[PDB]
Amino acid sequence: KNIESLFDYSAGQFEFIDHLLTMGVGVHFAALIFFLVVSQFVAPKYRIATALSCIVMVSAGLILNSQAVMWTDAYAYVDGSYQLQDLTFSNGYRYVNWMATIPCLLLQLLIVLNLKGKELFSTATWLILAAWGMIITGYVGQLYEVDDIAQLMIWGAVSTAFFVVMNWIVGTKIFKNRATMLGGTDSTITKVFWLMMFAWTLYPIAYLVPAFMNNADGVVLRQLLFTIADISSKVIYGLMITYIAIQQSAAAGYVPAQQALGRI
Numbered sequence: 001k002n003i004e005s006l007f008d009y010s011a012g013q014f015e016f017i018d019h020l021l022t023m024g025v026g027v028h029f030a031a032l033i034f035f036l037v038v039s040q041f042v043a044p045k046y047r048i049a050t051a052l053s054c055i056v057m058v059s060a061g062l063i064l065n066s067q068a069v070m071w072t073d074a075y076a077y078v079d080g081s082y083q084l085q086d087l088t089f090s091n092g093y094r095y096v097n098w099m100a101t102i103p104c105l106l107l108q109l110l111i112v113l114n115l116k117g118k119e120l121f122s123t124a125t126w127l128i129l130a131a132w133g134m135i136i137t138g139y140v141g142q143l144y145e146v147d148d149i150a151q152l153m154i155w156g157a158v159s160t161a162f163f164v165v166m167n168w169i170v171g172t173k174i175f176k177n178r179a180t181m182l183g184g185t186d187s188t189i190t191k192v193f194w195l196m197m198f199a200w201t202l203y204p205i206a207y208l209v210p211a212f213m214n215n216a217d218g219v220v221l222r223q224l225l226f227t228i229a230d231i232s233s234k235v236i237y238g239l240m241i242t243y244i245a246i247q248q249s250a251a252a253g254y255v256p257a258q259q260a261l262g263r264i
């Protein structure tokens, strides 16, 4: 049902996709070790924000690893090109994983925004429902990226509606609670908003690749966009969330955070 199954791949195309996914695994698990060791310098009220970055690193890294092995399982070098064998490759498993990773990314933002109590629970609930609506409708849409491009576009429009409403909740909460944030992170969090707008918009662009570049090079382009988007939306984003958590911890008087920032 996916455009990947339609083509043979040159050795160059096949190996580049394999290296993209493998490098993605290495970046996420390298960052996992960073978040783990820095978590001891985060104050208790923010420490779950850094733990969520560890959770996202392993979740994303495992999906990239699974995609890399599925890629090599599905194709073999036959008569001068990589050709589909008995097993299949699909991006649909990324969508299932977003059902978990996107709520984690959203929750760690709400934590460093200093939301608590009922506002935290209600904001998280609406954000997760909007995210799940976006993911599920996009998942259905990409089942038609070979058979029915018109249906891919309409499910994509519905998914984009959820996306825009989710981004509006995020922006409203960020610019409303920016004033509560300590240690100059009221400025940093505005950059986090724009990083999210940029990086998350790469995913719908990848989703439309079957509509504007339905060939083997488009398959490469989509994996390239996923790689840029994953590293930006999870790794760079998590590094900024962790910086904000540590900086607010130090401004709130958490001594391990003050000493960690002092030694750098």
Ligand SMILES: *C/C=C(C)/C=C/C=C(C)/C=C/C1=C(C)CCCC1(C)C
Residues within 6 Å of the ligand: 098, 101, 102, 105, 134, 135, 137, 138, 139, 141, 156, 159, 160, 163, 200, 201, 203, 204, 207, 230, 233, 234
């Ligand atoms: C770490 C993974 C992330 C941040 C995934 C983000 C995914 C999206 C923002 C998905 C967006 C989509 C649309 C905007 C409509 C087209 C279909 C969806 C899934 C791709």
Ligand SMILES: CCCCCCCC/C=C/CCCCCCCC(=O)O
Residues within 6 Å of the ligand: 012, 013, 016, 220, 227, 228, 231, 232
């Ligand atoms: C935050 C940014 C993360 C960047 C991740 C991407 C790193 C690798 C980028 C690729 C450089 C282009 C390589 C040329 C592709 C050759 C085309 C082909 O034969 O398949």
Ligand SMILES: CCCCCCCC/C=C\CCCCCCCC(=O)O
Residues within 6 Å of the ligand: 022, 023, 025, 026, 027, 028, 030, 031, 034, 235
């Ligand atoms: C096995 C595939 C290749 C493995 C790649 C290993 C290289 C990892 C490179 C950077 C990972 C990103 C993690 C960044 C940690 C914090 C960096 C910083 O403090 O500036």
Ligand SMILES: [Cl-]
Residues within 6 Å of the ligand: 043, 044, 045, 046
């Ligand atoms: Cl605390």
Ligand SMILES: [Cl-]
Residues within 6 Å of the ligand: 059, 060, 063, 094, 097, 098, 101
């Ligand atoms: Cl993911």
